[PDB]
Amino acid sequence: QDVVDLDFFTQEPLHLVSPSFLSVTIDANLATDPRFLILLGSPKLRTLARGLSPAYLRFGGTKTDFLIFDPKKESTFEERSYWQSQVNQDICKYGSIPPDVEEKLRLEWPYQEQLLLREHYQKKFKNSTYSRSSVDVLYTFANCSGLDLIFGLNALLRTADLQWNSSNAQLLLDYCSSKGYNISWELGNEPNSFLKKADIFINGSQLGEDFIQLHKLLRKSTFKNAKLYGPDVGQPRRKTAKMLKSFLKAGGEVIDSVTWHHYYLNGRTATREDFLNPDVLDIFISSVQKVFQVVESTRPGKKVWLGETSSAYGGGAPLLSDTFAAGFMWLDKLGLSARMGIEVVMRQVFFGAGNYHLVDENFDPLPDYWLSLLFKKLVGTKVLMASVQGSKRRKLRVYLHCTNTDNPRYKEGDLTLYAINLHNVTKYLRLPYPFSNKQVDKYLLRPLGPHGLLSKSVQLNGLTLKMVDDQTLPPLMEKPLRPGSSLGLPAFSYSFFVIRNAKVAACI
């Protein structure tokens, strides 16, 4: 019997996630050679980014702590040409990359990608500078795409006695003020591994003071209510958890949210079977509980954000992280994050080096992009709860929110269920009363074509998802179900279901 009964708990929200719950990163290493930031001038890229608004865009990564703002820095042919062609035109409406520059950067990018990826497993780590032009490219991409920029500041600029030296950051904040930029900030990326990365140990207590120091500069600036997030610690292993704890004791008062990072797997060792294994899905929970214990002990009630997360570290799992099979991890992460109290989840990455990107080297969306877009259109901010009657809840995983009321097909009271089937057979879900005789819109995602779960294309209710063109996302077409039908979920698939006229009081 492949018929599973659902229970729903709709009396009140367990949590309220941010409208920007599904957020994204651009790795700081895209600036290592800043020419490649010009790639963000693509209209195709903007079209795609806009589909994910509202969202935070976090500019940050390992390179965060090896980047230096230099207002005097000299521009390349590519940058001068990009900027010269934007003059006298509405950059958000009409901005594009000169074709010669676009072609040059697309030719160089695979090499650049290899270089950036190898800098991971390289022992050495070098400084680079970036110009005002680089900052401008990033701001305009975020602003034009309806995204909120979070900019990670370099925490390895140090005084003689290992306090954070804030003079470079001050030059940047001055520059951003003078331009009217609405930007939020971080300081440092994964400080827990600064010893490994730079021969310098900063403890959490010291990092707290560096944050307080940065806070004082943001209170002085022309944007007095600029938000500040931190500390962007890695996976909460014991040592990292202790660093977080001491950080929150010292400087937890001045952060608007606590940021930490999570990866399921090592990209070099991950298997296809790891991507489908509910034990691998379940370990994320352990991490979440350890983070909330640390936060509850030190700053109870403080918002908790996943500041950088993906399927696998090291740039992703070759041939796995860019496939339909990557969706189980992504959707389950969002599901669990929402249900356990995480307010924002920042996907590593929207675009850039690695194959855990949502959008590839050709600016084509991968299956996780479409998964993200569907999530964004259907799933509301109020998190409710669903469960499966039985003890095989490991392989049939179910989440329930109020329906996104910005969606014009639906209304207040409506419910959005999403579910993951990791069994190797079809399962059929029975909705509970009073949702057992409603019109229900199915949104089932399945891999296209011979590679199956390892495919990089996906269908929505039997229809291939593709950009209509560079300016235009397609409609996402529902499949109406017969009222009172069970909800069919094929083997190794995931789906959304919108329960229309559900009239849930909590969703109003």
Ligand X SMILES: *[C@@H]1[C@H](O)[C@@H](O)[C@H](O)[C@@H](C(=O)O)[C@H]1NCCCCCCCCN=[N+]=[N-]
Ligand Y SMILES: *[C@@H]1O[C@H](CO)[C@@H](O)[C@H](O)[C@H]1NC(C)=O
Ligand Z SMILES: *[C@@H]1O[C@H](CO[C@@H]2O[C@@H](C)[C@@H](O)[C@@H](O)[C@@H]2O)[C@@H](O[C@@H]2O[C@H](CO)[C@@H](O)[C@H](O)[C@H]2NC(C)=O)[C@H](O)[C@H]1NC(C)=O
Q: Tell me how far apart the alpha carbons of residues 86 and 84 are, in angstroms, rounded to a whole number.
A: 6
460 neighbors 445 (Cβ within 8 angstroms): yes
Helix H or strand E encompassing 173: helix 167-179
Give bridge partners of residue 57 from the DSSP assignment: 24, 149
In sequence order, the 6+-apart residues with CB closer than 8 A to the CB of 320 are 270, 271, 272, 275, 311, 312, 326, 454
Angstrom CA distances, 476 to 138, 265, 444, 473, 494, stand at: 29, 31, 11, 9, 15
Here's the x/- map for ligand X, 47-76, by CB under 6 A: it reads as --------------xx--------------
96 neighbors 140 (Cβ within 8 angstroms): no
Q: Which 392-421 residues touch ligand Z, going by CB under 6 A?
A: 392, 395
Residue of 424, 450, 472, 482 that binds ligand Z (CB under 6 A): 424
396 neighbors 419 (Cβ within 8 angstroms): yes
The answer to the question of whether 238 is labelled as a binding residue is: yes
157 binds ligand Y (CB under 6 A): yes
Residue type, 411: K
308 binds ligand X (CB under 6 A): yes
The answer to the question of whether 88 is labelled as a binding residue is: no
Q: Which 167-196 residues touch ligand Y, going by CB under 6 A?
A: 167
The answer to the question of whether 266 is labelled as a binding residue is: no
308 is known as an active-site residue: yes
Phi and psi torsions of 378, nearest 5°:
-105, -30
DSSP state for residue 346 in the 8-state scheme = E
Identify what 227 binds: ligand X, ligand Z, ligand Y, none; CB under 5 to 8 Å per kind: none
- Among the listed residues 287, 339, 279, 277, the one whose alpha carbon sits nearest the alpha carbon of residue 309: 287
> Could you tell me which stretch among 205-213, 306-314, 487-495, 498-506 binds ligand X (CB under 6 A)?
306-314
Residue type, 455: S
> Catalytic one among 78, 79, 308, 343?
308
27 binds ligand X (CB under 6 A): yes
For ligand Y, give the closer residue by CB, 202 or 346. 202
142 neighbors 151 (Cβ within 8 angstroms): no
15 neighbors 379 (Cβ within 8 angstroms): no
For ligand Z, give the closer residue by CB, 113 or 274. 274
> Could you tell me which stretch among 158-166, 302-310, 351-359, 478-486 binds ligand Y (CB under 6 A)?
158-166
Give bridge partners of residue 365 from the DSSP assignment: 359
The answer to the question of whether 354 is labelled as a binding residue is: yes
For ligand X, give the closer residue by CB, 314 or 335. 314
Here's the x/- map for ligand X, 259-298, by CB under 6 A: it reads as --x-x-----------------------------------
Q: Where does 272-373 show beta strands of DSSP type E? A: 303-313, 342-347
- The minimum distance between CB 309 and ligand X, in angstroms, equals 9
Report how far Cα 46 is from the mean position of its chain's Cα atoms. 16
Q: Tell me how far apart the alpha carbons of residues 41 and 309 are, in angstroms, rounded to a whole number.
A: 25
- The minimum distance between CB 241 and ligand Y, in angstroms, equals 14
> Could you tell me which stretch among 207-215, 240-248, 307-315, 338-346 binds ligand X (CB under 6 A)?
307-315
Helix (H, G, I), strand (E, B) or coil at 416: strand
For ligand Y, give the closer residue by CB, 167 or 437. 167
Cα Rg for the chain, rounded, in angstroms? 23
> Could you tell me which stretch among 199-207, 222-230, 305-313, 412-420 binds ligand Y (CB under 6 A)?
199-207
Query: What token pair was written down for 251?
Result: 């400087």
253 is known as an active-site residue: no
505 binds ligand Y (CB under 6 A): no
The answer to the question of whether 239 is labelled as a binding residue is: yes
- Tally Cβ neighbours within 10 Å of residue 168: 16
In sequence order, the 6+-apart residues with CB closer than 8 A to the CB of 315 are 117, 120, 267, 353, 354, 355, 356
167 binds ligand Z (CB under 6 A): no
> Could you tell me which stretch among 178-186, 194-202, 312-320, 338-346 binds ligand X (CB under 6 A)?
312-320
Identify what 205 binds: ligand Y, ligand Z, ligand X, none; CB under 5 to 8 Å per kind: ligand Y
Identify what 486 binds: ligand Z, ligand Y, ligand X, none; CB under 5 to 8 Å per kind: none
326 neighbors 311 (Cβ within 8 angstroms): yes
425 binds ligand Z (CB under 6 A): yes
Angstrom CA distances, 480 to 125, 251, 403, 477, 490, stand at: 54, 51, 16, 9, 17
The answer to the question of whether 44 is labelled as a binding residue is: no
Which stretches of 252-405 are DSSP H helices? 272-275, 278-298, 326-340, 367-378
In sequence order, the 6+-apart residues with CB closer than 8 A to the CB of 483 are 437, 438, 439, 440
291 neighbors 244 (Cβ within 8 angstroms): yes
Identify what 307 binds: ligand Z, ligand Y, ligand X, none; CB under 5 to 8 Å per kind: none
Residue sitting closest to ligand X (CB): 61
Q: Tell me how far apart the alpha carbons of residues 185 and 172 are, in angstroms, rounded to a whole number.
A: 11
203 binds ligand Y (CB under 6 A): yes
The answer to the question of whether 197 is labelled as a binding residue is: no
Identify what 165 binds: ligand X, ligand Y, ligand Z, none; CB under 5 to 8 Å per kind: ligand Y
423 binds ligand Z (CB under 6 A): yes
- What residue numbers does the annotated binding site cover? 27-29, 62, 123-127, 235-245, 261, 268, 313-315, 354-356
- Catalog residues that contact ligand Y under the rule CB under 6 A: 125-127, 157, 159-160, 162, 165, 167, 203, 205-206
- Catalog residues that contact ligand X under the rule CB under 6 A: 27, 61-62, 120, 189-190, 234-235, 261, 263, 308, 313-315, 348, 354
- What residue numbers does the annotated binding site for heparan sulfate group cover? 27-29, 62, 123-127, 235-245, 261, 268, 313-315, 354-356
- Catalog residues that contact ligand Z under the rule CB under 6 A: 392, 395, 423-425
Give the residue numbers marked as catalytic.
Answer: 190, 308
